[PDB]
mmCIF file of C-alpha atoms and ligand atoms in Angstrom:
data_model
loop_
_atom_site.group_PDB
_atom_site.id
_atom_site.type_symbol
_atom_site.label_atom_id
_atom_site.label_comp_id
_atom_site.label_asym_id
_atom_site.label_seq_id
_atom_site.Cartn_x
_atom_site.Cartn_y
_atom_site.Cartn_z
ATOM 1 C CA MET A 1 113.298 133.809 117.432
ATOM 2 C CA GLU A 2 115.985 135.452 115.208
ATOM 3 C CA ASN A 3 115.553 132.605 112.633
ATOM 4 C CA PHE A 4 112.156 134.096 111.665
ATOM 5 C CA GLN A 5 110.829 137.313 110.109
ATOM 6 C CA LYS A 6 107.320 138.402 111.124
ATOM 7 C CA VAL A 7 105.198 139.138 107.994
ATOM 8 C CA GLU A 8 101.783 140.049 109.551
ATOM 9 C CA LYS A 9 99.699 139.520 112.700
ATOM 10 C CA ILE A 10 97.421 136.560 111.804
ATOM 11 C CA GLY A 11 95.415 137.357 114.965
ATOM 12 C CA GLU A 12 95.438 137.401 118.781
ATOM 13 C CA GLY A 13 93.881 134.065 119.760
ATOM 14 C CA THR A 14 93.533 132.212 123.093
ATOM 15 C CA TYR A 15 97.220 131.186 123.505
ATOM 16 C CA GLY A 16 98.792 134.564 122.681
ATOM 17 C CA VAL A 17 99.527 136.292 119.372
ATOM 18 C CA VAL A 18 99.812 134.466 115.980
ATOM 19 C CA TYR A 19 102.068 135.737 113.177
ATOM 20 C CA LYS A 20 102.599 134.750 109.549
ATOM 21 C CA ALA A 21 106.387 134.391 109.420
ATOM 22 C CA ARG A 22 109.172 133.428 107.004
ATOM 23 C CA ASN A 23 111.865 130.939 108.157
ATOM 24 C CA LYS A 24 115.113 132.801 107.145
ATOM 25 C CA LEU A 25 116.880 129.367 106.890
ATOM 26 C CA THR A 26 114.476 127.217 104.760
ATOM 27 C CA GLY A 27 112.488 130.039 103.092
ATOM 28 C CA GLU A 28 109.240 128.386 104.332
ATOM 29 C CA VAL A 29 106.254 130.495 105.354
ATOM 30 C CA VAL A 30 104.870 129.371 108.707
ATOM 31 C CA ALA A 31 102.458 130.462 111.463
ATOM 32 C CA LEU A 32 104.278 131.485 114.630
ATOM 33 C CA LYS A 33 102.476 131.412 117.982
ATOM 34 C CA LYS A 34 104.002 133.252 120.994
ATOM 35 C CA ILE A 35 102.658 131.450 124.093
ATOM 36 C CA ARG A 36 102.191 134.202 126.789
ATOM 37 C CA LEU A 37 104.601 137.132 127.662
ATOM 38 C CA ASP A 38 102.798 139.605 130.038
ATOM 39 C CA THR A 39 101.031 136.628 131.795
ATOM 40 C CA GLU A 40 104.073 134.233 131.638
ATOM 41 C CA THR A 41 106.206 134.926 134.777
ATOM 42 C CA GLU A 42 108.689 131.985 135.099
ATOM 43 C CA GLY A 43 110.497 129.903 132.410
ATOM 44 C CA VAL A 44 107.621 127.675 131.053
ATOM 45 C CA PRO A 45 106.309 124.707 133.175
ATOM 46 C CA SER A 46 108.140 121.346 132.655
ATOM 47 C CA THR A 47 104.818 119.413 132.244
ATOM 48 C CA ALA A 48 103.699 121.945 129.542
ATOM 49 C CA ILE A 49 106.970 121.311 127.564
ATOM 50 C CA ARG A 50 106.405 117.513 127.702
ATOM 51 C CA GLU A 51 102.703 117.741 126.574
ATOM 52 C CA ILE A 52 103.544 120.051 123.622
ATOM 53 C CA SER A 53 106.414 117.668 122.670
ATOM 54 C CA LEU A 54 103.812 114.799 122.554
ATOM 55 C CA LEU A 55 101.633 116.955 120.233
ATOM 56 C CA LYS A 56 104.503 117.240 117.682
ATOM 57 C CA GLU A 57 104.031 113.479 117.097
ATOM 58 C CA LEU A 58 100.200 113.722 116.650
ATOM 59 C CA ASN A 59 100.530 113.937 112.802
ATOM 60 C CA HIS A 60 97.427 113.645 110.540
ATOM 61 C CA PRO A 61 96.392 115.327 107.180
ATOM 62 C CA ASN A 62 93.383 116.913 108.989
ATOM 63 C CA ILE A 63 95.500 118.361 111.792
ATOM 64 C CA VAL A 64 97.492 121.622 111.350
ATOM 65 C CA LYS A 65 101.063 120.311 111.574
ATOM 66 C CA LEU A 66 103.157 121.545 114.567
ATOM 67 C CA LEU A 67 106.491 121.843 112.681
ATOM 68 C CA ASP A 68 108.597 122.990 115.675
ATOM 69 C CA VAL A 69 108.478 123.952 119.375
ATOM 70 C CA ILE A 70 111.057 126.592 120.370
ATOM 71 C CA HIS A 71 111.761 126.925 124.095
ATOM 72 C CA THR A 72 114.394 129.747 124.066
ATOM 73 C CA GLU A 73 114.924 132.861 126.286
ATOM 74 C CA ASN A 74 112.646 130.948 128.782
ATOM 75 C CA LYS A 75 109.677 131.786 126.415
ATOM 76 C CA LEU A 76 107.662 129.382 124.229
ATOM 77 C CA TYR A 77 107.049 129.673 120.447
ATOM 78 C CA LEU A 78 105.068 127.175 118.398
ATOM 79 C CA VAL A 79 105.862 126.879 114.637
ATOM 80 C CA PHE A 80 102.853 125.635 112.645
ATOM 81 C CA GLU A 81 102.254 124.884 108.975
ATOM 82 C CA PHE A 82 100.511 127.914 107.465
ATOM 83 C CA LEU A 83 96.991 127.857 105.887
ATOM 84 C CA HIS A 84 95.542 130.928 104.143
ATOM 85 C CA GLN A 85 91.935 130.887 105.336
ATOM 86 C CA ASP A 86 89.680 129.765 108.172
ATOM 87 C CA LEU A 87 86.100 128.378 108.087
ATOM 88 C CA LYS A 88 84.633 131.528 109.790
ATOM 89 C CA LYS A 89 85.859 133.828 106.940
ATOM 90 C CA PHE A 90 84.766 131.204 104.372
ATOM 91 C CA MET A 91 81.257 131.030 105.952
ATOM 92 C CA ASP A 92 81.107 134.882 105.990
ATOM 93 C CA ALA A 93 82.152 134.970 102.281
ATOM 94 C CA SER A 94 79.553 132.206 101.516
ATOM 95 C CA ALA A 95 76.558 133.637 103.513
ATOM 96 C CA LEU A 96 74.630 134.817 100.356
ATOM 97 C CA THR A 97 74.644 131.462 98.499
ATOM 98 C CA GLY A 98 75.563 129.083 101.354
ATOM 99 C CA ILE A 99 78.350 126.466 101.305
ATOM 100 C CA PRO A 100 77.232 123.769 98.733
ATOM 101 C CA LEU A 101 76.028 120.635 100.604
ATOM 102 C CA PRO A 102 78.774 118.406 98.988
ATOM 103 C CA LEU A 103 81.548 120.684 100.421
ATOM 104 C CA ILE A 104 79.789 120.844 103.858
ATOM 105 C CA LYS A 105 79.771 117.005 103.819
ATOM 106 C CA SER A 106 83.472 116.786 102.720
ATOM 107 C CA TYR A 107 84.510 119.214 105.493
ATOM 108 C CA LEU A 108 82.445 117.342 108.148
ATOM 109 C CA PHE A 109 83.873 113.936 107.032
ATOM 110 C CA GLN A 110 87.515 115.189 107.107
ATOM 111 C CA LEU A 111 87.069 116.815 110.559
ATOM 112 C CA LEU A 112 85.551 113.569 111.832
ATOM 113 C CA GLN A 113 88.686 111.681 110.518
ATOM 114 C CA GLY A 114 90.848 114.316 112.308
ATOM 115 C CA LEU A 115 88.872 113.838 115.551
ATOM 116 C CA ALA A 116 88.859 109.987 115.215
ATOM 117 C CA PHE A 117 92.725 110.097 115.052
ATOM 118 C CA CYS A 118 93.094 112.518 118.012
ATOM 119 C CA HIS A 119 90.540 110.662 120.119
ATOM 120 C CA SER A 120 92.258 107.237 119.502
ATOM 121 C CA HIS A 121 95.396 108.925 121.034
ATOM 122 C CA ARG A 122 93.303 110.186 124.016
ATOM 123 C CA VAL A 123 93.839 113.817 122.858
ATOM 124 C CA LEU A 124 90.894 116.267 123.038
ATOM 125 C CA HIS A 125 90.616 119.614 121.262
ATOM 126 C CA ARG A 126 88.145 121.085 123.918
ATOM 127 C CA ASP A 127 87.693 124.418 122.054
ATOM 128 C CA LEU A 128 86.485 123.680 118.524
ATOM 129 C CA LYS A 129 85.163 126.679 116.586
ATOM 130 C CA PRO A 130 85.015 127.950 112.952
ATOM 131 C CA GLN A 131 88.054 130.238 113.683
ATOM 132 C CA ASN A 132 90.128 127.080 114.562
ATOM 133 C CA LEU A 133 89.327 125.236 111.329
ATOM 134 C CA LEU A 134 91.773 125.970 108.517
ATOM 135 C CA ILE A 135 91.146 125.401 104.824
ATOM 136 C CA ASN A 136 93.298 125.297 101.663
ATOM 137 C CA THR A 137 92.709 125.502 97.850
ATOM 138 C CA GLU A 138 92.826 121.673 97.491
ATOM 139 C CA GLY A 139 89.574 121.112 99.483
ATOM 140 C CA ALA A 140 91.249 120.117 102.778
ATOM 141 C CA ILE A 141 90.113 121.263 106.268
ATOM 142 C CA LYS A 142 92.398 120.977 109.331
ATOM 143 C CA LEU A 143 92.037 121.152 113.123
ATOM 144 C CA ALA A 144 94.221 123.911 114.641
ATOM 145 C CA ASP A 145 95.054 124.496 118.373
ATOM 146 C CA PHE A 146 94.627 120.701 118.999
ATOM 147 C CA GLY A 147 95.633 119.417 122.482
ATOM 148 C CA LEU A 148 96.819 122.894 123.647
ATOM 149 C CA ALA A 149 94.045 123.053 126.330
ATOM 150 C CA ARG A 150 95.477 120.350 128.716
ATOM 151 C CA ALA A 151 99.069 121.662 128.118
ATOM 152 C CA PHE A 152 98.066 125.092 129.596
ATOM 153 C CA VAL A 153 85.742 133.784 125.229
ATOM 154 C CA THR A 154 83.123 132.274 122.744
ATOM 155 C CA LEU A 155 80.750 129.808 124.451
ATOM 156 C CA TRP A 156 78.687 128.948 121.304
ATOM 157 C CA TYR A 157 80.247 125.452 120.734
ATOM 158 C CA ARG A 158 80.598 124.365 124.439
ATOM 159 C CA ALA A 159 79.179 120.901 125.274
ATOM 160 C CA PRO A 160 76.448 120.916 128.036
ATOM 161 C CA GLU A 161 78.547 118.686 130.401
ATOM 162 C CA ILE A 162 81.245 121.444 130.367
ATOM 163 C CA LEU A 163 78.572 124.116 131.136
ATOM 164 C CA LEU A 164 77.183 121.933 133.967
ATOM 165 C CA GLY A 165 80.625 121.835 135.676
ATOM 166 C CA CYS A 166 81.785 118.284 134.750
ATOM 167 C CA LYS A 167 85.530 118.285 135.602
ATOM 168 C CA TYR A 168 86.382 114.994 133.776
ATOM 169 C CA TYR A 169 84.647 115.513 130.442
ATOM 170 C CA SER A 170 85.545 113.324 127.426
ATOM 171 C CA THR A 171 86.201 113.257 123.657
ATOM 172 C CA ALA A 172 82.356 113.650 123.246
ATOM 173 C CA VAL A 173 82.816 117.439 123.890
ATOM 174 C CA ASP A 174 84.530 117.706 120.424
ATOM 175 C CA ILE A 175 81.641 115.865 118.767
ATOM 176 C CA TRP A 176 79.188 118.351 120.346
ATOM 177 C CA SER A 177 81.220 121.355 119.066
ATOM 178 C CA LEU A 178 81.481 119.802 115.565
ATOM 179 C CA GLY A 179 77.669 119.212 115.444
ATOM 180 C CA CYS A 180 77.186 122.926 116.264
ATOM 181 C CA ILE A 181 79.606 123.858 113.444
ATOM 182 C CA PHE A 182 77.744 121.425 111.040
ATOM 183 C CA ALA A 183 74.359 123.104 111.874
ATOM 184 C CA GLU A 184 76.018 126.557 111.274
ATOM 185 C CA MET A 185 77.442 125.650 107.819
ATOM 186 C CA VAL A 186 73.947 124.424 106.807
ATOM 187 C CA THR A 187 71.854 127.332 108.151
ATOM 188 C CA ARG A 188 74.342 130.260 107.818
ATOM 189 C CA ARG A 189 73.557 131.155 111.479
ATOM 190 C CA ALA A 190 75.138 129.984 114.742
ATOM 191 C CA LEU A 191 73.039 127.197 116.386
ATOM 192 C CA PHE A 192 73.508 128.363 120.037
ATOM 193 C CA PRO A 193 74.934 131.937 120.178
ATOM 194 C CA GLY A 194 75.084 132.420 123.988
ATOM 195 C CA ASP A 195 76.733 135.472 125.567
ATOM 196 C CA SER A 196 76.951 134.085 129.125
ATOM 197 C CA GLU A 197 77.222 130.522 130.455
ATOM 198 C CA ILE A 198 73.606 130.557 131.625
ATOM 199 C CA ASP A 199 72.363 132.068 128.333
ATOM 200 C CA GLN A 200 74.417 129.368 126.495
ATOM 201 C CA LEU A 201 72.818 126.596 128.600
ATOM 202 C CA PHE A 202 69.325 128.084 128.302
ATOM 203 C CA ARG A 203 69.619 128.396 124.479
ATOM 204 C CA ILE A 204 70.541 124.660 124.289
ATOM 205 C CA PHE A 205 67.548 123.793 126.545
ATOM 206 C CA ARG A 206 65.123 125.938 124.478
ATOM 207 C CA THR A 207 65.944 123.950 121.287
ATOM 208 C CA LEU A 208 66.727 120.409 122.577
ATOM 209 C CA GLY A 209 64.584 120.500 125.746
ATOM 210 C CA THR A 210 65.709 120.854 129.388
ATOM 211 C CA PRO A 211 67.605 117.557 130.036
ATOM 212 C CA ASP A 212 66.361 115.219 132.790
ATOM 213 C CA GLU A 213 67.249 111.807 134.286
ATOM 214 C CA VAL A 214 65.330 110.118 131.430
ATOM 215 C CA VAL A 215 67.515 111.411 128.545
ATOM 216 C CA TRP A 216 70.657 111.959 130.625
ATOM 217 C CA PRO A 217 71.083 109.720 133.717
ATOM 218 C CA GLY A 218 73.157 111.614 136.310
ATOM 219 C CA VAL A 219 72.371 115.118 134.926
ATOM 220 C CA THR A 220 70.618 116.294 138.180
ATOM 221 C CA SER A 221 73.803 115.387 140.087
ATOM 222 C CA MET A 222 76.088 117.578 137.870
ATOM 223 C CA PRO A 223 78.023 120.306 139.811
ATOM 224 C CA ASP A 224 76.138 123.313 138.358
ATOM 225 C CA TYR A 225 72.771 121.638 137.728
ATOM 226 C CA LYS A 226 69.920 123.557 139.436
ATOM 227 C CA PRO A 227 66.452 121.968 140.055
ATOM 228 C CA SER A 228 65.213 125.565 139.554
ATOM 229 C CA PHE A 229 66.192 125.379 135.779
ATOM 230 C CA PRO A 230 63.079 126.188 133.617
ATOM 231 C CA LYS A 231 61.576 123.137 131.854
ATOM 232 C CA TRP A 232 61.447 123.694 128.077
ATOM 233 C CA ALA A 233 60.066 121.126 125.615
ATOM 234 C CA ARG A 234 62.283 119.805 122.794
ATOM 235 C CA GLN A 235 61.846 121.149 119.214
ATOM 236 C CA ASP A 236 62.003 118.970 116.017
ATOM 237 C CA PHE A 237 65.283 118.966 114.019
ATOM 238 C CA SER A 238 63.246 119.754 110.866
ATOM 239 C CA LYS A 239 62.690 123.254 112.375
ATOM 240 C CA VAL A 240 66.293 123.531 113.694
ATOM 241 C CA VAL A 241 68.269 122.866 110.465
ATOM 242 C CA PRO A 242 66.050 123.217 107.317
ATOM 243 C CA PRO A 243 66.694 122.266 104.518
ATOM 244 C CA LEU A 244 69.109 119.546 105.759
ATOM 245 C CA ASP A 245 68.009 116.074 104.558
ATOM 246 C CA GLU A 246 67.050 113.172 106.937
ATOM 247 C CA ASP A 247 70.506 111.514 106.825
ATOM 248 C CA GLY A 248 72.137 114.839 107.843
ATOM 249 C CA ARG A 249 69.474 115.514 110.523
ATOM 250 C CA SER A 250 69.843 111.967 111.961
ATOM 251 C CA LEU A 251 73.635 112.352 112.153
ATOM 252 C CA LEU A 252 73.343 115.858 113.722
ATOM 253 C CA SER A 253 70.793 114.480 116.314
ATOM 254 C CA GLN A 254 73.402 111.869 117.378
ATOM 255 C CA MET A 255 76.231 114.442 117.593
ATOM 256 C CA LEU A 256 73.970 116.578 119.809
ATOM 257 C CA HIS A 257 72.916 113.845 122.299
ATOM 258 C CA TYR A 258 72.848 115.227 125.881
ATOM 259 C CA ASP A 259 74.352 112.156 127.488
ATOM 260 C CA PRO A 260 78.116 112.140 126.578
ATOM 261 C CA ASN A 261 77.937 108.301 126.636
ATOM 262 C CA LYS A 262 75.114 108.171 124.049
ATOM 263 C CA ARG A 263 76.739 110.899 121.815
ATOM 264 C CA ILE A 264 78.112 109.356 118.571
ATOM 265 C CA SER A 265 81.898 108.837 118.486
ATOM 266 C CA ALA A 266 83.963 110.303 115.564
ATOM 267 C CA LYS A 267 84.652 106.676 114.352
ATOM 268 C CA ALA A 268 80.968 105.661 114.305
ATOM 269 C CA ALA A 269 79.954 109.030 112.721
ATOM 270 C CA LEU A 270 82.254 108.224 109.716
ATOM 271 C CA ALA A 271 80.097 105.083 109.028
ATOM 272 C CA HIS A 272 76.830 107.062 109.020
ATOM 273 C CA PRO A 273 74.752 106.726 105.747
ATOM 274 C CA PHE A 274 75.034 110.563 105.319
ATOM 275 C CA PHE A 275 78.632 109.926 104.079
ATOM 276 C CA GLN A 276 77.669 107.175 101.537
ATOM 277 C CA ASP A 277 78.065 109.740 98.634
ATOM 278 C CA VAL A 278 80.899 111.872 100.169
ATOM 279 C CA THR A 279 83.285 113.464 97.579
ATOM 280 C CA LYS A 280 86.115 116.008 97.895
ATOM 281 C CA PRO A 281 85.026 119.203 96.057
ATOM 282 C CA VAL A 282 87.300 122.226 95.812
ATOM 283 C CA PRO A 283 86.172 125.598 97.299
ATOM 284 C CA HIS A 284 86.006 129.017 95.586
ATOM 285 C CA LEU A 285 88.814 130.746 97.560
ATOM 286 C CA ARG A 286 89.703 134.450 97.131
ATOM 287 C CA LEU A 287 93.103 135.115 98.799
HETATM 288 C C1 1YG B 1 93.114 132.186 108.652
HETATM 289 C C2 1YG B 1 94.624 132.313 108.444
HETATM 290 C C3 1YG B 1 95.361 131.673 109.619
HETATM 291 O O1 1YG B 1 95.075 131.939 110.783
HETATM 292 N N1 1YG B 1 96.310 130.753 109.267
HETATM 293 C C4 1YG B 1 97.078 130.003 110.139
HETATM 294 N N2 1YG B 1 97.756 128.988 109.684
HETATM 295 C C5 1YG B 1 98.280 128.276 110.730
HETATM 296 C C6 1YG B 1 98.053 128.759 111.978
HETATM 297 S S1 1YG B 1 98.628 128.278 113.566
HETATM 298 C C7 1YG B 1 97.142 127.511 114.229
HETATM 299 C C8 1YG B 1 96.527 128.509 115.124
HETATM 300 N N3 1YG B 1 96.991 128.926 116.298
HETATM 301 C C9 1YG B 1 96.145 129.931 116.678
HETATM 302 C C10 1YG B 1 95.171 130.113 115.707
HETATM 303 C C11 1YG B 1 94.034 131.127 115.580
HETATM 304 C C12 1YG B 1 94.213 132.263 116.586
HETATM 305 C C13 1YG B 1 94.021 131.724 114.173
HETATM 306 C C14 1YG B 1 92.697 130.440 115.849
HETATM 307 O O2 1YG B 1 95.410 129.183 114.716
HETATM 308 S S2 1YG B 1 97.070 130.199 111.867
HETATM 309 C C15 1YG B 1 95.108 133.750 108.296
HETATM 310 C C16 1YG B 1 94.583 134.784 109.065
HETATM 311 C C17 1YG B 1 94.975 136.097 108.851
HETATM 312 C C18 1YG B 1 95.910 136.390 107.877
HETATM 313 C C19 1YG B 1 96.467 135.369 107.133
HETATM 314 C C20 1YG B 1 96.067 134.057 107.341
#
C-alpha cells in the first residue's frame, strides 16, 4: 500500500510478515500485516473478507485495535495499532527477578476481560501465546491476532481437546492457553513445552494425570484418543507452580480443567477471590 512506509520487520508470524509502518497521510505509526503472497493464489476469499470486516467492530481496550483492512491489488493488508513490546520479550527481560506478582495479576485480569468480551461475541482467539500479547508503558496488555484463525508451530499452549482431535472446540481453549501463560509468568518456565503433538499431550498427562471418563466424560470417544495412552497419576499444584499462593493455584486449577465444560469461563474467572486486591501497576520497560 503506497499510503504507508515500511520502517522495520516486526517479525514473520503465522499470517505472513508484520511491519512497523508510518501512515504517510495521518503520520501515525502502525503495524502492517501482509496476509499471504507466495501461498495466496487467487484474489482473497469472499468469506475471509466478511469475517475480517466483523473483527474491525470487535473493539475493546484489551484487544489490539484493527484500524483498517486494505483489500487492494487482490492482496490483503491488515493495519493494526502499534505496541512496542510483547509479553515473551518482557518475560525474557524479567527472568532474573521474575514479574512482580501484582503485575502478573493485573495482566491476567486484563486478558480475562479481553477474553470475556471476545467470548460474549462468540469470537475465539485459538492461538494464544506470549508472542501474541502486547504491552505498553501504561500497564496495559492486549490480545493480538484475535479471530484471525476462523477467517483463514508452537504447541505449548494448545488445549487437550484440540490435541485429541475435537473439531468443534469452544471458547474454553483460550482459557486453557491463558492458564499456561499464567503458570509461565509465575515460574519463569513454560508449563508444557512439547515439541510434537504427542509429546505435548504426554507432558500435560504427566503433570495433570492421564484423563479418563471420571474427570472428563466423553474423553475416550475423542477422535485421537488411544486406549494405549500410558496412565500417569496427577501431581499437586503446589509442586507445579511454587510459590503461587492458594487463591492463584485454585484459579489456575480451574483454568486447567480437562473437561472444556468444567473449565472456568473468562467471566467467572474475573470474580475469583485471587482478583480481590487487583491493581494496575506500571512495568519497567526498556525500549
Ligand atoms: C513486540 C512488538 C510488536 O510486534 N508490535 C506490534 N504491534 C501491533 C502488531 S499487529 C498484531 C500482530 N500481528 C502479528 C503479530 C505477531 C507476529 C508479532 C505475533 O502481532 S505487532 C515489536 C516487535 C519488533 C519490533 C518492534 C515492535
